[PDB]
Design a binder for this molecule. Sequence first.
Ligand code: HEC
Ligand code: HEC
Ligand code: HEC
Length: 68
Amino acid sequence: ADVVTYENKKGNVTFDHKAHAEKLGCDACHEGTPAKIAIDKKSAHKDACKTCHKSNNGPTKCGGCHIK
Ligand code: HEC
Ligand code: HEC
Ligand code: HEC
């Protein structure tokens, strides 16, 4: 997807794939041949999601990605 969504009990998160990529350039979420990253509450909450935001706008204040 260019955009993706993950609905979760702690609130739904939008994923951008293209929309992130326009700033990121793939090899920032990915490295060396991109493929299906193991999204879970081990990866996501490590550098996967909870790193590359504190030096950006939008999500940071815990209640960021997760809406409702
Ligand atoms: C503030 C520090 C946050 C709290 C509290 C929680 N999150 Fe997250 N989160 C993100 C993703 C992509 C996932 C993976 C979905 C999965 O588990 O497969 C999660 C997951 C969780 C979960 C487990 C699911 C549930 O709803 O119970 C919990 C308990 C949870 N998160 C609490 C992404 C992000 C994210 C984007 C950068 C941020 C800022 C946070 N999560 C922050 C919090
Ligand atoms: C972090 C915000 C990402 C950016 C930026 C890019 N990708 Fe990505 N990609 C990401 C995740 C978390 C996943 C797995 C999604 C899931 O929950 O399964 C992926 C997956 C891919 C895949 C396989 C699935 C697909 O959509 O084809 C490929 C081939 C892929 N990603 C390529 C790719 C490229 C070329 C990017 C730059 C334009 C790019 N990704 C950015 C997370 C993120
Ligand atoms: C850098 C390598 C990033 C990674 C890895 C992830 N995200 Fe991200 N995210 C990043 C930036 C630069 C921004 C701000 C965009 C801007 O225009 O400046 C974001 C934004 C988000 C948002 C908010 C989207 C919105 O509603 O405006 C969400 C919901 C978000 N990011 C989620 C998210 C998740 C789930 C990630 C782990 C798979 C993830 N991001 C990785 C930079 C980077």
